[PDB]
Amino acid sequence: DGPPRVDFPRSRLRFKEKLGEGQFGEVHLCEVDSPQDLVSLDFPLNVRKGHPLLVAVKILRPDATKNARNDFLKEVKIMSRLKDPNIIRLLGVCVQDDPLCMITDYMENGDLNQFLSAHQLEDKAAEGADPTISYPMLLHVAAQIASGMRYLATLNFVHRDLATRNCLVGENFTIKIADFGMSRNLYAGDYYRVQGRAVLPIRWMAWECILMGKFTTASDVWAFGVTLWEVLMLCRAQPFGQLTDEQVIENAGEFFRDQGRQVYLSRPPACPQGLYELMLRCWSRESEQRPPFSQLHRFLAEDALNT
Numbered sequence: 001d002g003p004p005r006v007d008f009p010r011s012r013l014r015f016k017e018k019l020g021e022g023q024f025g026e027v028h029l030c031e032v033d034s035p036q037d038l039v040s041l042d043f044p045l046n047v048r049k050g051h052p053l054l055v056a057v058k059i060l061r062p063d064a065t066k067n068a069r070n071d072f073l074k075e076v077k078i079m080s081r082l083k084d085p086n087i088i089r090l091l092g093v094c095v096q097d098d099p100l101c102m103i104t105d106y107m108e109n110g111d112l113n114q115f116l117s118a119h120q121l122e123d124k125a126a127e128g129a130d131p132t133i134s135y136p137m138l139l140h141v142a143a144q145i146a147s148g149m150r151y152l153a154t155l156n157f158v159h160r161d162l163a164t165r166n167c168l169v170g171e172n173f174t175i176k177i178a179d180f181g182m183s184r185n186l187y188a189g190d191y192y193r194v195q196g197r198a199v200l201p202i203r204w205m206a207w208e209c210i211l212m213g214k215f216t217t218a219s220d221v222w223a224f225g226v227t228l229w230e231v232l233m234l235c236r237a238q239p240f241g242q243l244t245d246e247q248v249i250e251n252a253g254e255f256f257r258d259q260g261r262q263v264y265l266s267r268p269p270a271c272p273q274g275l276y277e278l279m280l281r282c283w284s285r286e287s288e289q290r291p292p293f294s295q296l297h298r299f300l301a302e303d304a305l306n307t
């Protein structure tokens with residue numbers, strides 16, 4: 001659980017592509033040369049013979065301030081603690097000399113938002129003639145997100161920014177939860193200045209997060225309710241897309257006032273009624289009435305398939 005004491009061989013990382021940016025610096029796609037030497041010092045790489053081993057590297061700015069440097073190593077320690085199939089896992093680090101590095105698996109299919117947008121629901125031939133996804137598989141995607149968040153809750157770890165844009169897709173519809181920050185141009189519209197505070201993902205936020213700034217596992221459940229909606233809409237629309245950002249903030253006030261003026265996300269066509277009612281409980285006014293991730297996961301893996 002402690003951070004690794006010996007660095008990954010920096011010289012083995014060979015650059016291919018830039019994957020992204022951030023205030024910290026860049027994330028690179030790298031190839032690991034002769035990876036069969038290194039699994040012997042695991043570093044549990046999933047070397048599949050006959051295939052090149054690709055890897056994502058989060059790299060600290062070479063011009064980084066001392067405080068950003070400090071923050072980067074704080075994250076190394078946070079990431080070192082996270083050990084679950086549905087959470088981004090640290091393969092290795094490089095911190096006993098510059099540049100500072102965190103290394104993780106490569107997910108071939110990028111973020112879940114862009115992946116679902118490219119798919120048509122199966123039975124619906126409103127196609128591009130073009131990738132389809134079955135309803136069982138939609139559910140399987142959602143179940144994996146639920147299981148990852150359930151793991152994070154056992155750690156008393158609060159994510160604060162769960163959404164499909166922060167989920168990565170590997171082979172066979174496998175999912176991992178990540179945390180990109182909010183610099184990607186593609187999702188600039190998912191973040192808005194809350195007065196007297198910070199730029200935040202208001203459309204995924206529980207009312208107590210918007211009004212007061214209280215983030216907890218129960219607010220993570222609320223964000224999952226919104227994330228599940230996304231998945232069952234196949235990411236064709238932003239939550240509360242009719243409403244302006246200012247209206248979204250006003251709507252949080254109406255949840256608090258609880259007088260029937262608030263509005264909720266409606267039921268996606270792909271979502272059965274039983275699953276919609278569970279979805280609704282995620283948005284309960286009282287935190288303690290929101291469902292535990294254990295319940296959410298069990299329903300998605302079992303009951304939602306037949307109803």
Ligand SMILES: Cc1cccc2c1C1(CCN(C(=O)c3ccc4[nH]ncc4c3)CC1)C(=O)N2CC(=O)NCC(F)(F)F
Nearest residue numbers: 019020027056057058088102104105106107177178179180
């Ligand atoms: C690369 C890297 C290394 C260490 C941490 C992190 C990362 C990242 C950097 C941002 N990032 C990417 O740009 C990216 C893009 C496309 C990709 N295809 N395959 C891999 C890959 C990676 C995702 C991975 C991250 O988001 N985090 C934060 C975290 O996952 N926190 C864990 C939690 F979500 F549970 F809170």
